[PDB]
Ligand binder design. Structure first.
Ligand SMILES: [Cl-]
Ligand SMILES: [Cl-]
Ligand SMILES: [K+]
Ligand SMILES: [Mg+2]
Ligand SMILES: [Mg+2]
Ligand SMILES: [Mg+2]
Ligand SMILES: [Mg+2]
Ligand SMILES: [Mg+2]
Ligand SMILES: [Mg+2]
Ligand SMILES: [Mg+2]
Ligand SMILES: [Mg+2]
Ligand SMILES: [Mg+2]
Ligand SMILES: [Mg+2]
Ligand code: NA
Ligand code: NA
Ligand code: NA
Ligand code: NA
Ligand code: NA
Ligand code: NA
Ligand code: NA
Ligand code: NA
Ligand code: NA
Ligand code: NA
Ligand code: NA
Ligand code: NA
Ligand SMILES: [Sr+2]
Ligand SMILES: [Sr+2]
Ligand SMILES: [Sr+2]
Ligand SMILES: [Sr+2]
Ligand SMILES: [Sr+2]
Ligand SMILES: [Sr+2]
Ligand SMILES: [Sr+2]
Ligand SMILES: [Sr+2]
Ligand SMILES: [Sr+2]
Lengths: 65, 56, 81, 194, 46
RNA sequence: GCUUUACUGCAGGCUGUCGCUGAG
RNA sequence: GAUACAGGGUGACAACCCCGUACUGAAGACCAGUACGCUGUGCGGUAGUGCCAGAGUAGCGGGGGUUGGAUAUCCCUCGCG
RNA sequence: CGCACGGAGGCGAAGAACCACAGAUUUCCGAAUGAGAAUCUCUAACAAUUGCUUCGCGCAAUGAGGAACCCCGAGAACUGAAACAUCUCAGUAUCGGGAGGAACAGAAAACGCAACGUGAUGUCGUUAGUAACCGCGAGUGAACGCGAUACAGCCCAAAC
């Protein structure tokens, strides 16, 4: 939604690795708020975070790291 | 001592357990052989023609 | 590839270990050792770990009780996440 | 003129006469101390080997196998049997000793395929046969216009399905006419009456 | 009895399967857990 | 199921013979 | 209306309300790495020549199994050849 | 935004859903192959058996599965004979081994409507319940040929 396939291909191998760790941290911090059962949540974003990490890992395979 | 109800009390031994190969509770933990799939006895899976009617 | 830290274990007993004993509780991957849980907590939160106590919970997951050094405050680390 | 091969052939017509009598008396002493299946570099009967399909090439293997002499090693019935089915002593197996030898060899060499075999004699308690086996995966054979047929998928485990010459003879497939009513195209299709 | 790590994971799963069909599934399907196992009345594996 | 000098057979033991098996 | 009156759906019996149905056309798979075509090799005939042509085989006997196979099935085993 | 009609939220004109093809990922046990183990663990692995070989696991092979079909081996008994032993049930049930998309068979040391004839092999129809077997009891039981289907013939060993 915010991250598209073309935008990941416009990145460099080091920008993907940095975006991977950034989304993993946003996922871990979303899973932390879910562990406490918070109210200001967004159920659609935690779903998109997993798909975005999948998209980066797929492009990392296609390009050769 | 009767062979019925009073002899059932000594039954606290574990023999048949969940199998690593097939998932059935037929892995004899003392024989190390599965009574269902034959794990521990054969590389081939245990199957017999008598498990079904002759013309089936 | 599997990650070491799954999510923080936040229950009442987890808070008593945080407020009184300077310990943070985490639900980790069951293939992860005490030393691996130690490293991952330091590399993710920028703290110094002294001792890690693990347990294989009746939920299929592994619970880790991670004690931080006196320079670090467990309450402050749990508040930002 | 005669080939040198014709002399190895003529010697083997009578393995109890001449120089061969002395040779076999000596060789069998070493063979009795050898295993069940022994790979040998060169065939004992070159003429017969070459006649059967052998070539001094890569991927062509020969092995000598010893199988016991006599009838079936039968266990007596442990349940009710009518008089006709109560025998132990006089029962003989339907597969000949040569076919047992070929199968034992093929199992010792799982990757290879049985081409043929021949007899190399016997003593009082056992029989010896040399089996010519072929490597279907070696390019020296995949390019051979005389042996590349054995490389086909349907030639896999040919000995266990009776596709050897000894297999086909023991199955009663020699005769093309009278006598082979219950044997051709297979023993199984004819209700096992061959 | 002493349980192994795998036996512990299996017993753990059986306990999780022992939960009820959530309130929302009843509304979504517009109106029953058939794998309801009791520790005394029923028997598990191993 | 069991018995035996019931009928018929099958193992097993004993024994001859052939092969292994050769020299004077 | 119909080269379409097969079938289904749709708040009750539907060719014409909807999917389809006839007609025409497209793709994939199988046939098949086959047929046809092609490249290369070279078919065959006369006369002379006892140079070559698969052995425990052909065949015989003892004992068994198997078969419709009877003397005349196929096979195994022991001995001989 | 599956089955599944909820609540919250989200994705989609940057053309999502959905379908076809191809590709990525694809935990652990599992032939299970570094070693062990009830799906886990311990300290680099084609374990085991083979072929080739630079003789080094360097290059390869095998293993196990599949509804039944197929091929090669092992092979009952109830039953029938109004008893029962040969016979019959039956080369059936069941067991061991193995291949394929089909198997097996196959270019005559054939046939033998005996011919001045046929011409690889399966299979189908028929030949025929005929010939043949059989306490000649009960039962058992072909083939050549013919009409079809489809057709396709070839390679070694040796001589030199
Ligand atoms: Cl083989
Ligand atoms: Cl004719
Ligand atoms: K009977
Ligand atoms: Mg502990
Ligand atoms: Mg057939
Ligand atoms: Mg509970
Ligand atoms: Mg019979
Ligand atoms: Mg292992
Ligand atoms: Mg009876
Ligand atoms: Mg009767
Ligand atoms: Mg009578
Ligand atoms: Mg019969
Ligand atoms: Mg005939
Ligand atoms: Na959790
Ligand atoms: Na083999
Ligand atoms: Na219980
Ligand atoms: Na009785
Ligand atoms: Na027969
Ligand atoms: Na005989
Ligand atoms: Na997949
Ligand atoms: Na391998
Ligand atoms: Na090697
Ligand atoms: Na009767
Ligand atoms: Na009776
Ligand atoms: Na009879
Ligand atoms: Sr007593
Ligand atoms: Sr006990
Ligand atoms: Sr065993
Ligand atoms: Sr089986
Ligand atoms: Sr719990
Ligand atoms: Sr195989
Ligand atoms: Sr109870
Ligand atoms: Sr000839
Ligand atoms: Sr023809």
């Amino acid at each position: 939604t915010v991250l598209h396939v073309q935008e990941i291909r416009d990145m460099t191998p080091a920008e993907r690795e940095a975006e991977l760790d950034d989304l993993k941290t946003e996922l871990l911090n979303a899973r932390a708020v879910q562990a406490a059962g918070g109210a200001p949540e967004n159920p659609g974003r935690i779903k998109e975070l997993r798909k975005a990490i999948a998209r980066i890992k797929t492009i990392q395979g296609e390009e050769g790291d | 001592t009767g062979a019925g109800t009073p002899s059932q009390g000594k039954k606290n031994t574990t023999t048949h357990t969940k199998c690593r190969r097939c998932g059935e509770k037929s892995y004899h933990t003392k024989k190390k052989v599965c009574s269902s799939c034959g794990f521990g006895k054969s590389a081939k899976r245990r199957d017999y023609e008598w498990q079904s009617k002759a013309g089936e | 590839s599997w990650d070491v830290i799954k999510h923080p274990h936040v229950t009442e007993k987890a808070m008593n270990d945080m407020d009184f004993q300077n310990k943070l509780q985490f639900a980790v991957d069951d293939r992860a050792s005490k030393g691996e849980v130690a490293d991952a907590v330091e590399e993710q939160y920028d703290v110094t770990v002294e001792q890690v106590n693990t347990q294989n919970t009746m939920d299929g997951e592994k619970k880790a009780v991670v004690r931080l050094s006196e320079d670090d405050d467990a309450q402050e680390v749990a508040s930002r996440i | 003129a005669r080939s040198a091969y014709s002399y190895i052939r003529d010697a083997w017509k009578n393995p109890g006469d001449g120089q061969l009598a002395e040779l076999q008396w000596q060789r069998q002493q070493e063979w009795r101390n050898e295993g069940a299946v022994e790979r040998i570099e060169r065939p004992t009967r070159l003429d017969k080997a070459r006649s059967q399909g052998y070539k001094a090439k890569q991927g062509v293997i020969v092995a000598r196998v010893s199988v016991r002499k006599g009838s079936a090693r039968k266990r007596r019935h442990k349940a009710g049997r009518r008089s006709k089915r109560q025998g132990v002593t006089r029962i003989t197996r339907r597969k000949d000793i040569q076919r047992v030898a070929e199968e034992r060899a093929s199992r010792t060499f799982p990757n290879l395929r049985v081409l043929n075999s021949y007899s190399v004699g016997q003593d009082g308690r056992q029989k010896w046969h040399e089996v010519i086996l072929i490597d279907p995966n070696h390019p020296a054979i995949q390019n051979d216009d005389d042996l590349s047929w054995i490389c086909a998928d349907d030639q896999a485990d040919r000995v266990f399905r009776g596709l050897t010459g000894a297999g086909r003879r023991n199955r009663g497939l020699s005769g093309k006419g009278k006598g082979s009513e219950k044997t051709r195209p297979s023993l199984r299709s004819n209700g096992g009456k061959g | 009895g002493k349980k192994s790590k795998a036996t512990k994971k299996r017993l753990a799963k059986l306990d999780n399967q022992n939960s009820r069909v959530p309130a929302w599934v009843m509304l979504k399907t517009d109106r029953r857990n058939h794998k309801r196992r009791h520790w005394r009345r029923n028997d598990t594996d191993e």
